[PDB]
Amino acid sequence: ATLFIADLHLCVEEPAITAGFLRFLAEEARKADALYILGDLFEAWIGDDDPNPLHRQMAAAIKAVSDSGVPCYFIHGNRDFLLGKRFARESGMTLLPEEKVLELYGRRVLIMHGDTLCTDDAGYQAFRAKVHKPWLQMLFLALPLFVRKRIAARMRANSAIMDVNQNAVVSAMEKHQVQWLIHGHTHRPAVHELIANQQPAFRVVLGAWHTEGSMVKVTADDVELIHFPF
Ligand SMILES: CN(c1ccccc1C(=O)Nc1ccc(S(=O)(=O)N2CCN(c3cccc(C(F)(F)F)c3)CC2)cc1)S(C)(=O)=O
Ligand SMILES: [Mn+2]
Ligand SMILES: [Mn+2]
Predict the structure, then answer these.
(1) Residue 136: CB within 6 Å of ligand 1?
(2) Segments making up each domain of the chain, as ranges
(3) How far is residue 208's CA from residue 184's CA, in Å, rounded to a whole number?
(4) Separation of alpha carbons 134 and 215, rounded Å
(5) Up-side HSE of residue 23: CA atoms within 13 Å toward CB?
(6) How far apart, in whole angstroms, are the C-alpha atoms of residue 207 and residue 8?
(7) Cα separation of 68 and 57, whole Å?
(8) CB of 214 closer than 8 Å to CB of 207
(9) Residue 54 CA to ligand 2 centre (angstroms)
(10) Which of 19, 58, 67, 120 has its CA 20 to 30 A from that of 37?
(11) Does residue 45 contact residue 83 with C-beta atoms inside 8 Å?
């Protein structure tokens, strides 16, 4: 079975999520064929050099999973788009592109964070357009940690998540010719039915973690959205 999670928003002052993720890693993920983390693993990311002890501990925990024989893959979310190759090495994760098609037990499944589907949110898409320019990322990362942190305090006070655009959903699923899509971002967990490629299709939406978690579990038999206790 292949597992998908997203929208953990890990944060020092949300210890229930930290504990729940550590358990998931030790119990569920160790038994999987593969683990995919579809963005917003962290509440915020200002660079791989951040000395936050949470990052040390979470990297070692994820790396224990891939070091055990279970590959771990990451797609960036809007919160953690700066997570880079240094932290990918620390955590034993492979970084994926924005959109990726998997072939799982016969079935072709598109995965993404989901923010690129929220095409009606003008402010968000403008924000996203700038902060994804490599040259600008390199300048922000060159700033001192304490400056990066003050900037990030503003930007989060300043920032209710707009839901996906249906034309964007269908366009992505027809571009990749898939009948299955898994994403997060919107924090509205559900299995939706729709039409893509003039056939039945499914859009499976992960939930954010707070007092419990969610995963999608993919087997040859089934695609299941599972909501599970800490
Ligand atoms: C859907 N979200 C939004 C909606 C509208 C507008 C923005 C967002 C959004 O994701 N905001 C948001 C995302 C991440 C963060 S952060 O992790 O604290 N941090 C903030 C500092 N960032 C940064 C700022 C300028 C240039 C560059 C650079 F590029 F130079 F590195 C990077 C790096 C990321 C802070 C704010 S929401 C409601 O969750 O906040
Ligand atoms: Mn999220
Ligand atoms: Mn998001």
Answers:
(1) yes
(2) 2-229
(3) 8
(4) 31
(5) 12
(6) 9
(7) 17
(8) yes
(9) 18
(10) 120
(11) yes
Measure the CA–CA gap between 129 and 115, rounded to whole angstroms.
12
Q: Alpha carbon of 100 to those of 13, 59, 227: distances in Å? A: 32, 23, 24
192 annotated as a binding-site residue:
no
Say if residue 40 carries a ligand binding annotation: yes
- For residue 4 the two structure tokens come to 């998908």
Reference 214, options 206, 222, 204; nearest CA is 206
Which residue is listed with tokens 């944060």?
11
Q: How far is the CA of 121 from the centre of ligand 3 (A)?
A: 13
E strand or H helix at 156? helix 145-158
Pocket flag, ligand 1, residue 142 (CB < 6 Å): no
Resolution (A): 1.9
The count of other CB atoms within 10 Å of the CB of residue 140 is 15
Q: In CATH, which of 3.40.50.1000, 3.20.20.70, 3.60.21.10, 2.60.120.560 is domain 2-229? A: 3.60.21.10
d(CA 97, CA 107): 20
Buried b / exposed e along 24-57 (16+ C-beta atoms within 10 A) = bbeebbeebebbbbbbbbbbbbbbbebebeebee
Q: Which amino acid is at 114?
A: G
Residue 35's identity, in one-letter code, is L
- Do the annotations mark residue 188 as ligand-binding? no
